[PDB]
Design a protein around this ligand. Structure first.
Ligand SMILES: CS(=O)(=O)N1CCN(Cc2cc3nc(-c4cccc5[nH]ncc45)nc(N4CCOCC4)c3s2)CC1
Length: 841
């Protein structure tokens, strides 16, 4: 290789937080073969990407402007403001104008075309052949009541992104030699057996078992388990799933390797324990912790695969099946129907998930007939993209690489606006791929390299998992490495800054927990020991500036040490604030970040992202619900950072105005708080209007996701009336709509009023609107549960959102469901709010 060529890889390992050149936890070479496989997709995308547009990463959309934003234009005229050091004139522009065209109405409007419209304060450019109506920064300014401000400077040089020179009819059988574990002790001794499953997409094709034996630290069976399934009938992607019950341990082994070879030989597999169903149960990875983990020893010595029209009455039976939801389980009668009428079923794209579930993958002939099916894919290829539908073929139920490829094909048609909407959920879906190299993993690689913004979030989503998941770190590390070798040195330098900063601060956060008590208050000497520590970093240690990971436009600078503090709260997070490093920023307002170690933030990532998806859904139907899905990024193990929404206050704090007598509660208080922070009465009604939309948006969203029973303490409001929920780490109430909220709506329980009439109207509007996307939400939820929780009932915890979205019912009933829910909160008032307290003391 080379002296400095290996110094490149030690930079790569530092950003990844894992060494992909390590081979100490492999029993084959799939991971290294995947490093080599991804060189091509990388070099292709890099080689065909526009240098100019890659440097500026214009964030842009082809969707129509919503109805709720053409109301803020009674005149077909939008206001932009071009800047230059001191002075800065304003310019009349029509929504359909272009970056180039408004430069035509600036220079010629004055009485050399190699300048650019960058945004004031950020690294966000208005460029490329798009209308300004169709730029995200512009839609954002219109949405808030802000005015588009812009500075004129030289385009950033493409030179800075340049990339370095790169680098049988025999039945199947397995011998169970035995198991071994250095130490087991609990208290009393039991018996133990090994269960072997041939598995394919959460379908057990076959299952044999050992005789049981006593659970000493070594147990030897020496037994052949003859299976019924024949070798030729083994499908690519099938897993030998070895499990130990007395269900304490599990491990998996792909029966057909990444070169289509039948798996053969002597394996010692180090196994995962079960924490006192989910995506960790599917992994081909073995436990790296070889000193403590349980190990199984096996032997393979077994290569391969090298007219008439329906009666109208069955069609109805078949259509009914196809209509049902992604969780509605299929009977044997239903599957056989689907399969017998394959070709009719292929005419309905929505039937696809249900159809490929009806396939007997445990049979060679039928899989082949299934490949004949996928070969005449005219209707699918021509169908309009359905993200819900496409996602379903990427979940844990589908292990066939061709099935999964027809789904990835549909994704290729997404523009970058929609990729960012689904990116986190597509990164989690790499967990369900049988092989490390996959159409999906490559699709992300390709989309990330093509767009600096997708690239940026693909970095942190990958790194979040690598840091806190032994089950999938090696796979994701290989994928990240591939990204980093093609993202270009501007982005590598950027990440290196970001990784350095957060490593310095997490250090400070862990070092501060320990000097404070397990829990009480915040010491005089502890705010002493926070300021001192950050003064030492600030000088010769911290970058002059780093990219804010949750908002990669914004460049944070030097710390505002006076405003930083440890938080009198759960597990001593740091409230930090930074100066903005861009001197053309039009405000002296700091960037606020919380650093927390203790909670599990991947869950918050996931919930906030589904919340961003609901906003986008409501966009399809002219519905704005003023949600504040604030930034939130997991960076490492049980730890990460959070955006501080400026001017926000906990609802429980507004109730603790005085005393707050261990849980005193009072209807009228919220409304008084709103008038104090609103210098004109005019802005006060703007706040109540904002509170009715926001309260409604967070009510509907929260009912649907089953996270609505919350303390006042985890709900906030801005000075401008924008309500929002926080801290999604996990008698009853479907959601929070307490008497304090209702007095803002001019209604003190058991009445109706103009502002409350809006609230109900908006709620049912929002609720029926999410139901036009029932299959999407069910599948995102089901996946959320599987890749981002503890262990969970693959039927029962998902089955909440069915009943929440009132599946199978007509629209009138559905409204009547939700409207009962509102009146459950108003029939209970404070009962549950007060109840959180009763346990405590
Ligand atoms: C005297 S004190 O300085 O200690 N004071 C006490 C009362 N605090 C109220 C808050 C608690 C809080 N927790 C979180 C959080 C905690 C853990 C996990 C989380 N996931 N998402 C948020 C979040 N995120 C917060 N946000 C997010 C949105 O932007 C405003 C700050 C706030 S604000 C402020 C601090």
């Amino acid at each position: 290789m080379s002296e400095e060529s290996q110094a490149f890889q030690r930079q790569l390992t530092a950003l990844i937080g894992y060494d992909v050149t390590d081979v100490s936890n492999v029993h084959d070479d799939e991971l290294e073969f995947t490093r080599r496989g991804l060189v091509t997709p990388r070099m292709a995308e890099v080689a065909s990407r526009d240098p100019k547009l890659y440097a500026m990463h214009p964030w842009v959309t082809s969707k129509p402007l919503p109805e709720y934003l053409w109301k803020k234009i009674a005149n077909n005229c939008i206001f932009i403001v071009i800047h230059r050091s001191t002075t800065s004139q304003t310019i009349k522009v029509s929504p359909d104008d272009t970056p180039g065209a408004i430069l035509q109405s600036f220079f010629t409007k004055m009485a050399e075309q190699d300048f650019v419209l960058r945004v004031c304060g950020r690294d966000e450019y208005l460029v490329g052949e798009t209308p300004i109506k169709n730029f995200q920064w512009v839609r954002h300014c219109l949405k808030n009541g802000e005015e588009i401000h812009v500075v004129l400077d030289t385009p950033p040089d493409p030179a800075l992104d340049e990339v370095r020179k790169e680098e049988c009819d025999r039945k199947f059988r397995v011998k169970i030699r035995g198991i071994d574990i250095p130490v087991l002790p609990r208290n009393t001794d039991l018996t133990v057996f090994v269960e072997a499953n041939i598995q394919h997409g959460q379908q057990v094709l076959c299952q044999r078992r050992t005789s049981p034996k006593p659970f000493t630290e070594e147990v030897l069976w020496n037994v052949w388990l003859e299976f019924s399934i024949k070798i030729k009938d083994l499908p690519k992607g099938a897993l030998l799933n070895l499990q130990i019950y007395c269900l304490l341990y599990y491990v998996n082994l792909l029966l057909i390797d990444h070169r289509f070879l039948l798996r053969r030989g002597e394996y010692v597999l180090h196994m995962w324990q079960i924490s006192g169903f989910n995506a960790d149960k599917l992994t081909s990875a073995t436990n790296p912790d070889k000193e403590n983990s349980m190990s199984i020893s096996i032997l393979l010595d077994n290569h391969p695969i090298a007219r008439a029209e329906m009666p109208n009455q069955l069609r109805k039976q078949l259509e009914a099946i196809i209509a049902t939801d992604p969780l509605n389980p299929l009977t044997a009668e239903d599957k056989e129907l689907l399969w017998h009428f394959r070709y009719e079923s292929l005419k309905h794209p929505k039937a696809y998930p249900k159809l490929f579930s009806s396939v007997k993958w445990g049979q060679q002939e039928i899989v082949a007939k299934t490949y004949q099916l996928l070969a005449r894919r005219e209707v699918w290829d021509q169908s309009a993209l359905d993200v819900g539908l496409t996602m379903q073929l990427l979940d844990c139920n589908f292990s066939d690489e061709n099935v999964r490829a027809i789904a990835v094909q549909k994704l290729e048609s997404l523009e970058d606006d929609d990729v960012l909407h689904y990116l986190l959920q597509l990164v989690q879906a790499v967990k369900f791929e049988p092989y490390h190299d996959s159409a999906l993993a490559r699709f992300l690689l390709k989309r990330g390299l093509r767009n600096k913004r997708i690239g940026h979030f693909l970095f942190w989503f990958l790194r979040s998992e690598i840091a806190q998941s032994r089950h999938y770190q090696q796979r994701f590390a290989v994928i990240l490495e591939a990204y980093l070798r093609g993202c270009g040195t501007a982005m590598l330098h950027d990440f290196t800054q970001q990784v350095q900063v957060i490593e310095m601060l997490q250090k400070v956060t862990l070092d501060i927990k320990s000097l404070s008590a397990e829990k009480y208050d915040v010491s005089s000497q502890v705010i002493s020991q926070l300021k001192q520590k950050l003064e030492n970093l600030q000088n010769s240690q911290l970058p002059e500036s780093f990219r804010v990971p949750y908002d990669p436009g914004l460049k944070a600078g030097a710390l505002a040490i006076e405003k930083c503090k440890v938080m009198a709260s759960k597990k001593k997070p740091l409230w930090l604030e930074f100066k903005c490093a861009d001197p053309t920023a039009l405000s002296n307002e700091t960037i606020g970040i919380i650093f927390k170690h203790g909670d599990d933030l991947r869950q918050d990532m996931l919930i906030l992202q589904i919340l961003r998806i609901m906003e986008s859904i409501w966009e399809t139907e002219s519905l704005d619900l003023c949600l504040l899905p604030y930034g939130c990024i997991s960076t490492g193990d049980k730890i990460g950072m959070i955006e501080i929404v400026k001017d926000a206050t906990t609802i429980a704090k507004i109730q603790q105005s005085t005393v707050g007598n261990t849980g005193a509660f009072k209807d009228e208080v919220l409304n008084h708080w709103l008038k104090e922070k609103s210098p004109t009465e005019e802005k006060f009604q703007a706040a109540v209007e904002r509170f009715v939309y926001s309260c409604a948006g967070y009510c509907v969203a929260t009912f649907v996701l089953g996270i609505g029973d919350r303390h006042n303490d985890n709900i906030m409001i801005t000075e401008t009336g924008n309500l929002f929920h926080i801290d999604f780490g996990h008698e009853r109430v479907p959601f929070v709509l307490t008497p304090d909220f209702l007095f803002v709506m001019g209604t003190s329980g058991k009445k109706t009023s103009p502002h409350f009439q809006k609230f109900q109207d908006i709620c049912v509007k929002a609720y029926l609107a999410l139901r036009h996307h029932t299959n999407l939400l069910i599948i995102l939820f089901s996946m959320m549960l599987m890749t981002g929780m503890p262990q969970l009932t693959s039927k029962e915890d998902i089955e909440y959102i069915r009943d929440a979205l009132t599946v199978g019912k007509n629209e009138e009933d559905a409204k009547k469901y939700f409207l009962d829910q509102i009146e459950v909160c108003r029939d209970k008032g404070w009962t549950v709010q007060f109840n959180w307290f009763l346990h405590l003391v």
